[PDB]
Every structure is written in structure tokens, then in C-alpha cells.
Write a protein that binds this ligand. Structure first.
Ligand code: HEM
Ligand code: HEM
Ligand SMILES: CCCCCCCC/C=C\CCCCCCCC(=O)OC[C@H](O)CO
Ligand SMILES: CCCCCCCC/C=C\CCCCCCCC(=O)OC[C@H](O)CO
Ligand SMILES: CCCCCCCC/C=C\CCCCCCCC(=O)OC[C@H](O)CO
Ligand SMILES: CCCCCCCC/C=C\CCCCCCCC(=O)OC[C@H](O)CO
Ligand SMILES: CCCCCCCC/C=C\CCCCCCCC(=O)OC[C@H](O)CO
Lengths: 157, 157
């Protein structure tokens, strides 16, 4: 099996939905004024991470989507993407930090489930999802700290 | 083909993400004061529609996820789901009616592509998506009318 451009571009187009949430809800002064941990990355790190992940996750899905028995893996993939799209509107749109922690935690679970199901069909597709699970872990940690350091403000859920 | 509860519940859980956007962004007085066409349904119709569609689309995806060549169909399904999740944050969260029309139009394309790809593998999966395409058409019309009848308000954007 090889590069299937129809599949890859379909999965890449699907990443247009979360990318659109980030483009329309760029962090503002509210984000700057939030209490954040010292290990909170600078602003320019986040566009680099998600652009890379969108390409990595669509490559991996393209490989898996060509294999028999793909059904459960691709259902997991649909779930993680939808909750990925949900996160930025919850955190930066509605300003509900605690609810957003629930969202990223569910997303984390489905990312892990997708990665595992990918490993059962295609090892490289699973490997391609390893930096996504690492980054999703990191995002979960940053959501928790932001929520914790601003617990006494109404933005907590 | 089979009744596969693991697959069905995975697709149903995936619809929790768009359902969460609806739960968190209930239409308010801003929606009430918008100019609407006469065929704009009452508020109680929309929860009925979307609950039904979540189950129909998950049953249909469950059938497709059990066949060979499902990959392109499920990639279309993933794409459609993510833009479904994106719509309500754009229209009711950010209040960008014109931008939301672009989102529902892309979602419409992927609904149609999913339904057609579903018909190539399983007729029942395709038929189950016919009420989804109809409702998405209807939703597109309501977005268009809302934007057009309120063109001179800043939310038309
Ligand atoms: C699952 C969790 C998350 C998702 C899906 C997500 C998604 C995104 C997306 C799509 C972008 C746009 C990147 C681009 O323009 O190419 C972005 C940027 C950004 N996000 Fe995240 N994000 C998540 C977690 C977080 C967290 C926890 C924080 C802060 C505590 C955060 C802060 C930012 C910032 C500061 C930027 C870029 C701001 C700038 O470019 O000036 N994100 N994110
Ligand atoms: C792709 C397009 C759309 C999606 C994905 C979507 C999604 C949803 C969801 C998930 C709910 C929650 C239903 C529930 O609570 O069970 C909802 C309710 C609702 N939506 Fe939509 N919607 C769309 C288009 C529209 C449009 C175009 C309008 C109006 C012009 C609209 C108006 C409403 C109203 C009035 C409610 C319920 C309000 C209430 O229960 O009091 N929706 N929608
Ligand atoms: C039966 C097989 C044939 C049918 C299969 C359909 C094949 C093409 C589907 C979608 C491509 C259109 C989407 C535009 C191209 C994707 C790359 C892109 O530009 O969007 C990525 C996104 O912007 C990143 O953030
Ligand atoms: C076959 C069906 C084709 C469906 C049409 C696909 C075109 C839109 C896809 C991605 C663009 C979404 C926004 C692109 C990224 C903007 C945010 C940065
Ligand atoms: C051809 C079938 C697969 C053959 C085995 C390939 C997968 C190798 C496993 C992990 C990469 C090492 C970890 C990634 C680098 C750190
Ligand atoms: C594919 C291997 C056999 C399947 C066994 C494990 C895979 C599915 C497990 C749980 C369903 C997903 C979680 C249930 C739906 C969330 C609510
Ligand atoms: C292998 C197992 C993978 C893990 C899978 C199980 C994890 C939970 C999944 C989704 C959250 C459940 C649904 C999220 C809430 C949706 C319902 C809802 O919010 O409806 C609002 C009304 O009110």
C-alpha cells in the first residue's frame, strides 16, 4: 500500500474544522492576563505543533483506511477529531476552563484509543500517532494548570 | 453485516461532541430577535431532529465500518462530523452568521459525499443518510435566510 491522495486529502480537509476554530478564536488579552505556569510555551509554539499534527494524523489515517478491519480504528479517529474541534470553542470562545478540561480529557482517551487501534493494523500509523498522544497529554496538563491557577475566577467552567 | 455494539457506541459517543456544542450554546434573545422566514421551525423541533440524526448516522456508519472499501466512506464521515461540530460555535458562539454559512455549506458537501459513498457499499447505510442530507439542506436554507434577513446587523459576518 502507498500514498492514497484522495484519502489523505479527505483526512487533511477534515482537519480544516479544528484549524478554523483556532484561526477564528486567536488568544487575546484575556489569555495574556490568565495565570499560567512557567512551562507555558510561547505563542509561536502552538501553530507549529498543530500544523505538524494535522499532517501526521492524516497520513496515519490514510494508511489505516486502506486496510481490512479498519472500521473500529476509523470510528475512534472520527471521535478524537470531533472532540478536538470542540476544545477551542469551549476554552477560548465560551471561556469555560473546567468544562474544557473535560473535553480535552475525552479527546485524550480517544487519541489513545485511535493510537492503539492503529498499532493493531499498521505499526507506522501507530507511531505517527505517538507525538499526537504526547502533545495531547501536554495540552491536558496545560488545561489543568490554567484551570487551577485561575480557580477563583468565573472562567472556571 | 452485523449488529456491532462496539462500533455503534463509538460513533454515538463521537456525536457527543456536536451535541455538547448545542448543550453549551443554547440560542437566546439574540436568536429570538433575529428576522426569520415563516418556515423557520419552532425551538422544540431541533432537539428532536438532532437526536434522531445522531442515531441514524451512527447506525449507518456502523454498517459501513464492517465492509471492505469502507475507508473513503469513513473519511468522508469523519470530515462531515468535524464540520458539524464546528457550526454551532461559529453561529451561536461567535455570532458570525455569514462565516457559519460557509461552514454549513462545506458540511453539506461532506454529508452528500458520505451518503453517496455509503450507497456504493450498503444500500441501507445510504438510505439511513437520506434524512440527514435533507435536514442539512434545510439547515443550510435557514442559515442563508438568517444571514440575508439580518444583513445589516454586525453579526452578519
Ligand atoms: C486539545 C486541546 C487543544 C486544541 C485542539 C487546540 C487547538 C489549537 C489550534 C487549531 C490552534 C491554531 C494554530 C494555528 O494558527 O495554526 C491553536 C493555537 C493556540 N492555542 Fe491551542 N489547542 C489546544 C490546547 C491549548 C491550550 C491548553 C492552550 C493554553 C493553555 C492553548 C493555547 C493556544 C495558543 C496560545 C495558540 C496560538 C496563539 C497565537 O498564535 O498567537 N491551546 N490551538
Ligand atoms: C449544521 C448546522 C447545525 C447544527 C450542527 C446544529 C446543531 C444543533 C444542536 C446539537 C442542537 C442541540 C439540540 C438538543 O439540545 O438536543 C441544536 C439546537 C438548536 N438549533 Fe441548531 N444546528 C444547526 C443549524 C441551526 C440553524 C441554521 C438554526 C437557526 C437558524 C438553528 C437553531 C437551533 C435552535 C433554535 C435550537 C434549540 C433551541 C432550544 O432548544 O431552545 N440550528 N442545534
Ligand atoms: C471515490 C474517491 C474520490 C472521492 C474522494 C474525494 C477526494 C478529494 C476530497 C477532498 C479534497 C478537497 C479538500 C481540499 C484539499 C485538501 C487539502 C486542503 O487544502 O485543505 C486542508 C486544510 O486546509 C488543512 O488545514
Ligand atoms: C469532496 C468534498 C470537498 C469539500 C470541500 C473541501 C474544502 C474545505 C476543506 C478545508 C477548508 C477548511 C478551512 C481551511 C483552513 C482554514 C483555517 C486555517
Ligand atoms: C514494516 C512493519 C513495521 C516494521 C517496524 C517499524 C516500526 C518500528 C517501531 C517503532 C519505531 C521506533 C520508535 C520511533 C522512533 C523513536
Ligand atoms: C476492535 C476490538 C474489539 C472491540 C473491543 C474494544 C473496542 C471497542 C470498545 C469499546 C467501544 C468504544 C467505547 C464505548 C462507546 C463510548 C461511550
Ligand atoms: C475505548 C473507550 C474510549 C473512551 C470512550 C468513552 C469515553 C467518553 C466518551 C464520550 C463522552 C460521553 C459523551 C459526552 C457528553 C455527550 C452528551 C451530552 O453532552 O448531551 C448534552 C445534553 O444535555
Amino acid at each position: 500500500m502507498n500514498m492514497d491522495w484522495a484519502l489523505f486529502l479527505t483526512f487533511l480537509a477534515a482537519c480544516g474544522a479544528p484549524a478554523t476554530t483556532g484561526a477564528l478564536l486567536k488568544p487575546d488579552e484575556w489569555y495574556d492576563n490568565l495565570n499560567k505556569p512557567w512551562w507555558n510555551p510561547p505563542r509561536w509554539v502552538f501553530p507549529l505543533a498543530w500544523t505538524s499534527l494535522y499532517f501526521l494524523m492524516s497520513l496515519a489515517a490514510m494508511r489505516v483506511a486502506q486496510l481490512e478491519g479498519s472500521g473500529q480504528a476509523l470510528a475512534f479517529y472520527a471521535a478524537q477529531l470531533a472532540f478536538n474541534t470542540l476544545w477551542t470553542p469551549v476554552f477560548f470562545g465560551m471561556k469555560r476552563m473546567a468544562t474544557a478540561l473535560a473535553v480535552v480529557m475525552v479527546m485524550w482517551l480517544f487519541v489513545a484509543a485511535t493510537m492503539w487501534a492503529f498499532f493493531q493494523l499498521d505499526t507506522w500509523a501507530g507511531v505517527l500517532f505517538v507525538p499526537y498522544l504526547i502533545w495531547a497529554t501536554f495540552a491536558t496538563g496545560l488545561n489543568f494548570e490554567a484551570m487551577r491557577l485561575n480557580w477563583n475566577r468565573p472562567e472556571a467552567r
